[PDB]
Design a protein around this ligand. Structure first.
Ligand SMILES: CCCCCCCC/C=C/CCCCCCCC(=O)O[C@H](COC(=O)CCCCCCCCCCCCCCC)COP(=O)([O-])OCC[N+](C)(C)C
Ligand SMILES: CCCCCCCC/C=C/CCCCCCCC(=O)O[C@H](COC(=O)CCCCCCCCCCCCCCC)COP(=O)([O-])OCC[N+](C)(C)C
Ligand SMILES: CCCCCCCC/C=C/CCCCCCCC(=O)O[C@H](COC(=O)CCCCCCCCCCCCCCC)COP(=O)([O-])OCC[N+](C)(C)C
Ligand SMILES: CCCCCCCC/C=C/CCCCCCCC(=O)O[C@H](COC(=O)CCCCCCCCCCCCCCC)COP(=O)([O-])OCC[N+](C)(C)C
Ligand SMILES: CCCCCCCC/C=C/CCCCCCCC(=O)O[C@H](COC(=O)CCCCCCCCCCCCCCC)COP(=O)([O-])OCC[N+](C)(C)C
Lengths: 307, 307, 307, 307, 307
């Protein structure tokens, strides 16, 4: 088996798409193996560029096709090259921009914690013909500053395993294990924008909703509650335009439904305080002691729901 | 006729587009047939990569072109390879990302139930020259968890038939049947997001609409009803931005029109209760017993409309 | 001149873009002509695939380039093939996905009636070297059901004409007529969604606008009219987001302006009924008999504008 | 120097992008020059198609590369051909779809007046080796009707000049002038949609804003003014979604700010009329004679700002 | 080492994408080095076009591959050419359209100040085989007028350095320094649109918010404050649709939160002025002297926050 040493340079990770669960990684890949000795011009190593590589492969040079398992489509390969040494050492360096995929969980949306996975595997050669020796990952370009949307936490985590394919038992007996490289990069979201523009004014709106029981009349309370309901609907749409599409409810979504429930509970208490009459003229004040109890009860419900 | 055995691996199904009725499938395809015996280097099977295949076809190798019937455009073929055995067995493995199409019914939108169809057919050879032996479909990567937008229900369903083309009777008599493979994958939508963010607050708004007959005056009722109408219009737009474009009304759309009808019926009852006067000063209370009857009548109408 | 017989199969028509006046057609094209006799392997006809065709053209095979006149850009040609008969008959079958263009009129938007045109012409050969014999169009896949956005009315309409180009008189005297094939497919829009979600609640809002003259006071009337004006602006935006961009006003647009005019006329009548005072205290009731006349006058104006 | 005669056929101009200042032109280009005499099959001129041209250039045929100077990227070249005459006359016809760029001024947005420029230049040959003889432009397909978004005013305007490049003085002395063709097409926007849907209801809203001084009380005036402010904000967003993104304020934008200023001036006059009290109880009517003066003053300010 | 002289012509810089931190540069690149003398046809220099260059490289011509380090993907190379002199001087001219990337800071959004960076480096040759002699940058096409979105301040700034790669110490000892060219272009945003459409009406809305303490009653104050809160939410959404997506709060965002805080502080002062009662009937005027103090305090807070 040929021992291939891979090195992956990550230049930038961006373009996270929550609906399709993809992201875009840009960088280089450097594979290195040892073949037969050869005589190059002089003694210095020989360099083959982008179109010239196909000319050398047609003449019988062995260059394996390394596949990204979780890429969507095909990577946009830029420049690529081969460096052939007279010793017999071959180095294949290429640049990619792919759209990779993973199992991404956005259920805690502003306070999220994802990891970005690249999986690499030979397209055709099992580990009796090509096994990966070692893998170094250089993520020195991606940073941790407040400008960046995602905080990359620590260096990348690497792994080399042997994936077994059970459909090859009919045609390739005893040789169906393929050598796979996995690269994981942990990342934490920047929650500052979503905490200052979305979480806080919704809390202010919900807190200002509770001050309709200071109104003296009853029709004033209902008209004010319906104005607050329109405010909560407008805020729900204001958040739901500027946020990533998801098939489940995030934290912000949980708070919008809490706002709707607060408005409807306020309307129900106003009606029940109005309806407590002997025949239609007897006023009420005992139920309206919830100017300091209903906000606390709703806050306790929310604190239970957070835990 | 040459017997070709196909195997389709489905990696992910995503990107469902309701207006154009498309979806995107990513995966592999493995065709396998038996030709003439040959002498390879050694006795081990020979492998041909991506660009090298065109070199072997020019020298006379028979590789059929398998077409996806319902693909839109042309698939984005990534890596592809041929494995040639000295026995005479040929295996063609290729990776695709296509945008397929089907007859999709979204008339029950959140509680939907679709099926994803892939149809495969030789581009040029009828079943007197190429017929499909058997087909295995491996959908082991696509899952059922709550993160996933679509719940894939059970294994895929396969079929091999003979499609007859009547336009070939002029030039190819008695040979116009083509062998076609059909693959169906049933899927159910994740209705949790649409049931918590769209169905429930609309029900709360419509339920809170009925509490305008507790208001004492008449001008208060009209101003409150118009505020509720603006709330329903804002909610209609809030849903209709965040939802898939369709040429027909879904469930959520049916509920928005029910909300408009509830507002207009409330306005009509307020006017008819106001207008019941002898000359302009006689008040009314008999018609305003619909504080507990009109909500029940509207709920009965909605329950009839669901069934 | 060589007689070429074309057959066009339409698979689906979709993706209508109103601003750029384009649409997307997917399907096949089958051209068939007769050349010189040849000796094929055996007596059976020979098949040439996608890349192999370029090899046969370099050796001197005559394959004309058929151009779509109204395509925008270049079609995304998928698989293509040549079938060469020993008789001398040649059949060229290819698959396309193009973005075609036409002169489209959306001035009656929900109740629209368009036709989709494909124009085909040889790129280089005038009718003294290549004329189109006959053309069959098979639109059997596109349907009429309620799921489909567009109702295709009847079979396609075909035509073969001779287009004359006057700029070729300087370099090609007496030979400047080119043979052109035109294919027209009539289609009617699905108006159900736009009639239930856009036309009807706007009518309900405009009808509920007229019930502000039942209010007793004057400040109540002005505040209520301004609330209705905000409702009409919100509805105008709700429609104008979910509709195709156009450089002219459609029916729905005509109704939005009718709603604005109804609100402004209501405000003008409220002011003129208020202003009819001797010095500032004399009330009015004679002008306020338009609770049953102004709606009828506006409906008559709208009925005149429809006709 | 070789004299090349160009003819440009414009098929359609569409897809104007205001932010990037681009537009899309589709059409043909026909260059024609005279070379060496040759012997073709027979005496009739010979035709070379799309892929065959590269075969003739490798054998030594001189085909210059004509570049569009202001194209963004590279044009989507469709079919192309060469017609070789035995006289020695060569005609190169090709079809393009490019995304061209210009210095576009949208500061008078609905009543705009732009011109579309195509600049053509040889990529490599200066005017001592290739100079453009004459240029005809055929814009017969683009029209003036009310369906069209842009009204093309008159025939195209053409020009042939000699552009001098000062960076070539180091390596190519006395030969750095290149022959450039410029084509200008004047166009006027269709202002009907923007005048009926955007200019007029904003004028109605601003005119209805002035009728808050007919209200008797003071709190009614403030609540009504704030409702009008919300109406103007909603209208500002309704226009600003459905309009082209620009880095400066257009006419419609000028009118939105005029509406905001009218609302704020109305609020200031209501406050100043309220505040004119001896101690807090003295009413006012002298300042409230601006029910017929403040609208006229604002209209005079707007008429000054238009001029 | 071969001395290569680069010249970069910038045609336009556009398409700035704030989320992915990219921009698009269009222009030319002219590299020039000196090789071996050769015999061309005649004595005039020879020109090689777009497809012909690959033919000359296969025969052994040395053309280095110059890479853009910060490009995303691969540039859309249009026309390219080689000019070969009999002296031995080689000139490689090519046209690119790339999507470059940089570390962009939009934290002061309308009053921004960015710089656009292009980095150029040989793909394979270290500075013992290829070092960059000098670099001229011609930005004569990009301007400073008010039509342009970005004001380019002064000429471009150039630099030539030696980047050292530490991963090459294992296979290429003592030769791992690569010659890199950096080009920086400073640019200032056009703040006029954002200052007239976004900053000023928000200031008018916030200033008009302070005039709710002129209202006499208490329920009027609360209803008016909630109407103002809905106005601020609608304005927040109106700005946040028409602005670039960012992971942090800009100036406009800071002002929206200031508006929310002003509304909530106004509500708190109205409640605290209402609540100052002995048992529920004692009115208040001492706290309501903040009709001229609370606006000044909020303005002082904002002026502190600006500094
Ligand atoms: C026997 C004594 C009983 C106690 C009564 C004492 C009264 C004190 C009551 C005080 C009510 C306190 C208000 C807090 C309600 C918040 C609800 C909430 O956030 O959940 C929201 C829905 O909430 C709703 O649907 C609204 C329904 C609220 C009904 C309560 C009104 C009670 C008045 C009756 C008084 C009648 C008086 C009688 C006079 C005749 C959802 O929360 P979420 O987690 O954000 O959603 C995410 C869900 N996923 C996505 C995770 C799946
Ligand atoms: C002889 C006795 C008669 C009984 C009267 C007794 C009163 C009790 C009345 C009570 C009214 C009950 C309110 C429920 C109305 C819901 C309607 C609804 O959802 O359908 C919606 C439209 O609805 C509308 O268009 C609004 C019109 C409503 C008119 C009713 C007012 C009656 C008042 C008169 C009282 C006058 C008093 C006289 C005083 C002088 C559409 O439903 P959808 O399915 O969601 O749409 C989908 C359609 N597709 C897409 C499937 C195609
Ligand atoms: C001498 C007797 C005169 C009769 C008066 C009797 C009163 C009865 C009056 C009754 C008024 C009836 C209301 C109907 C108005 C609808 C207008 C409409 O839709 O056209 C819309 C604009 O409409 C507007 O611009 C609004 C202006 C309306 C002005 C009328 C108020 C009259 C009050 C004065 C009373 C003063 C009382 C005096 C007290 C002192 C546009 O329609 P469209 O087709 O949808 O637009 C598409 C256009 N394209 C795209 C096709 C180009
Ligand atoms: C000594 C006598 C003085 C005369 C007072 C007589 C009163 C009569 C007053 C009558 C006021 C008339 C209202 C018309 C205002 C329109 C403003 C406008 O459109 O410009 C807009 C901004 O406008 C604003 O910013 C709003 C500020 C308006 C302030 C006026 C209130 C005066 C009340 C004080 C009375 C106090 C009474 C005292 C009681 C104690 C911008 O216009 P634009 O062109 O669309 O913007 C585009 C700009 N670019 C893009 C081109 C760059
Ligand atoms: C001991 C004496 C104490 C003094 C009281 C004297 C009263 C005078 C008070 C006057 C209040 C003055 C109003 C100005 C408030 C502006 C706040 C602001 O913009 O910051 C905003 C949040 O603001 C808020 O969250 C709203 C909270 C405001 C609370 C103040 C009400 C005090 C009433 C109590 C009176 C009770 C009376 C007692 C009767 C019983 C955020 O600002 P930003 O920079 O835009 O955000 C960007 C942040 N990043 C992105 C940079 C990170």
């Amino acid at each position: 088996p040929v021992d291939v040493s891979v090195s992956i340079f990550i230049n930038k990770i961006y373009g996270v798409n929550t609906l399709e669960q993809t992201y875009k990684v840009d960088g280089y890949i450097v594979a290195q193996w040892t073949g037969k000795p050869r005589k190059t011009p002089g003694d210095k190593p020989l360099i083959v560029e982008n179109t010239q590589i196909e000319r050398w492969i047609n003449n019988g040079l062995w260059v394996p096709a390394l596949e990204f398992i979780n890429v969507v489509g095909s990577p946009d390969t830029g420049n690529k090259r081969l460096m052939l040494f007279p010793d017999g050492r071959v180095i294949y360096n290429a640049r990619f921009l792919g759209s990779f995929s993973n199992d991404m969980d956005f259920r805690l949306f502003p306070f999220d914690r994802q990891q970005f996975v690249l999986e690499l595997e030979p397209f055709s050669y099992n580990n009796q013909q090509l096994r990966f020796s070692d893998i170094q990952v250089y993520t020195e370009n991606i940073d941790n500053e407040e400008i960046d949307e995602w905080w990359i936490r620590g260096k990348a985590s690497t792994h080399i395993s042997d994936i077994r394919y059970d459909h090859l038992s009919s045609v390739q007996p005893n040789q169906n294990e393929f050598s796979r490289i996995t690269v994981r990069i942990d990342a934490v979201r920047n929650p500052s924008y979503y905490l200052w523009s979305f979480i806080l004014p919704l809390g202010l709106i919900i807190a200002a909703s509770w001050s309709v029981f200071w109104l003296e009349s009853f029709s004033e309370r209902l008209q004010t509650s319906f104005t607050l309901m329109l405010t909560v609907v407008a805020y729900a749409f204001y958040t739901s335009n500027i946020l990533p599409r998801l098939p489940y409810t995030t934290v912000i979504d949980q708070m919008i439904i809490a706002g709707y429930g607060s408005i409807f509970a306020a309307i129900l208490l106003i009606i029940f305080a109005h309806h407590r009459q002997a025949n239609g003229v007897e006023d009420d004040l005992l139920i309206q002691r919830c100017r300091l109890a209903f906000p606390l009860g709703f806050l306790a419900i929310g604190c239970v729901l957070v835990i």
